[PDB]
Amino acid sequence: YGVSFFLVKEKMKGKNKLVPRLLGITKECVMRVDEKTKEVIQEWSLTNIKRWAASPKSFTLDFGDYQDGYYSVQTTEGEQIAQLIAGYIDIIL
C-alpha cells in the first residue's frame, strides 16, 4: 500500500460551485491532482497535518491554522482519505 488517490471536488474560479478533482495522499504529502491529467497541481506535507476532518460528503485538512490552514474538498469518502492520512501521520510522525 502506497500513495492513495481520491476524486474530490474543489472550489475553483470562474463559477461558484465545486469542480471534480483528484487528491493524492502520499506518505509524505497531500496533493490536489488534476483528475483531467492526473498530474499534481498542489502539494502539502502529510507530516505537516495538524488536524483533519472527514465527512460523508466531504473531507478536510487543517494545516496552517496560523493563518488559513484549512484545505477541503467534496468527497463522499472522507474516512477513506482521512483514515489513511490519519494512518500516514501515524507513520511519518
Binding site: 472550489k11 488536524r51 476532518a53 465527512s55 477541503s72
Partner: peptide, 24 residues
C-alpha cells in the same frame, strides 16, 4: 484530542461553498 474538530472543520468547510474559495 477529539471533541468538536469535525464540526470545527465542517463549519470552516462552509467557507468553501460560500462563494470565495481560496482568494488566491
Amino acid at each position: 484530542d477529539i471533541d468538536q474538530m469535525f464540526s470545527t472543520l465542517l463549519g470552516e468547510m462552509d467557507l468553501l461553498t460560500q462563494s470565495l474559495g481560496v482568494d488566491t
